[PDB]
Design a protein around this ligand. Sequence first.
Ligand SMILES: CN(N=O)C(=O)N[C@@H]1[C@@H](O)[C@H](O)[C@@H](CO)O[C@H]1O
Ligand SMILES: [Ca+2]
Length: 579
Amino acid sequence: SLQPPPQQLIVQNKTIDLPAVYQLNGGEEANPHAVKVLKELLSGMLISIGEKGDKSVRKYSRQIPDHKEGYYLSVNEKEIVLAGNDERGTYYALQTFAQLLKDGKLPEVEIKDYPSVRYRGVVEGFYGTPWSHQARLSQLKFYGKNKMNTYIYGPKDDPYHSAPNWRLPYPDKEAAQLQELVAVANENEVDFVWAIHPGQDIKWNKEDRDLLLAKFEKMYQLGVRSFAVFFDDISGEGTNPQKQAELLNYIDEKFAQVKPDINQLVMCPTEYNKSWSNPNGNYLTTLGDKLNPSIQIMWTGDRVISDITRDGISWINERIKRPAYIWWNFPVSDYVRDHLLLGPVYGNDTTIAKEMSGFVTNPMEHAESSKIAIYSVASYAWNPAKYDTWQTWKDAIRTILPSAAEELECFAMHNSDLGPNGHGYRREESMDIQPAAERFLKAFKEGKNYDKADFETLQYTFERMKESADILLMNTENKPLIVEITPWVHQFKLTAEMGEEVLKMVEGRNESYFLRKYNHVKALQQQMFYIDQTSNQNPYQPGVKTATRVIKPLIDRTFATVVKFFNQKFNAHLDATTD
Ligand SMILES: CN(N=O)C(=O)N[C@@H]1[C@@H](O)[C@H](O)[C@@H](CO)O[C@H]1O
Ligand SMILES: [Ca+2]
């Protein structure tokens, strides 16, 4: 089950063993990063590793795809061939090789691969608590594993990339940590893109221009080889696309064209989605016209939160006269901070790879939890035409938490919707039991017998959520993930219990039992409010919501309805509300 799926793949249905004795050909010649991975997989048979042009992979150079980051991989009993179009490609061959190895044994196959989107990875662009240094080292290694080549770096607690301290050099301590990120991004074939955010206090004069240049040069000396300049945050003169183009072209010419090894050079426009673009203005096409063709322009789609469509990307491509570099604002939850967004990644058109220069995801402030979407994005961006939302979602989860994948699946299935929000952006959730939920409720609401099978499905779900919750909380394979999701897990358990007791009210043996359940529900609704007042307290959407699209309303509505039915029956007046 390769992730991302290779462009071309032929499997033989024979299978050889990792050879106990082998002979490495190209050890000296291939990308050291890939070879290091090979040595670690290899802790006799001919294994050939190298890039196009290496003496070691001469025999196979017609098999190597002619694409940046492409590779040829081969496995049969005679030899193993791992051969890149360039260094990054060989490393990518090795990342695929590692997924093939299962029990010192390899399948016999032949693969020709390359990415369909040129740039792919993550932009650290969410409001909230910034990630720790450690979380970032871990992200970078996860990117290399999934062949993401882009990391746009922006922690919001580092003031040396924005007003006013962008002007200033990183202090020693922070510098060295930053170097460490760059070192790790290099080893894993990721472009560390340092992004500067000047728009707040930038002057259109030559001195500020020079200070930026020198800042870029300092980052260069610390190892950075890719750069972004942000203009989303600016006003007045600064909003002139003409002048933005001049400054960026200026940096291209005096800097990027002058160093030998500058990879990405990227800007974020002042109008970065169609809806905040002024059709009575000039901004985009002027930028398109005046900005050097090798400079990327970032774009989030039709609206701030938006999936990428064919209409959507034509519309921006026509204007900037190049393929947009997509900034996808999902799974970022910084405007729905009381939700986790753990669902699958979908909605982006799968036939538009030629039309986009980059694809990056803006993740949640929950770094590990974000790995589900991130792995899915890497898959989508590498081979959109073979993109399989749901298999890739299950694959991500099995990858992040193999020892409790079914449990994270159950939990994630019911934590994907945003609930109503200022952006009007929603996701599906709980689709598996939706039909049973809706039938049971329609029948139940109208005094009409519900179906036993729907009742049992709901029962079953609640039981399974409790099991999953409890396994999740005690799991120690990925502690960071568990630390991140714990409050919500507790909340998810409470939801399940609440569901169980309400269902017991529906089954309703006798009046006294019914009041026990009723009081137990009130008490549980009560601990949910507790958690929601004491956990995840942030200024904007403080708290913890879970299972909110289908499940909590099914339970609330079933509760109101059953109490109503109880009040008629016994001329009682129990409060029927869930709030
Ligand atoms: C491209 N871009 N800023 O340049 C953004 O997407 N910025 C913020 C982005 O940082 C934020 O996560 C979302 C949702 O809160 O709102 C956007 O406006
Ligand atoms: Ca070489």
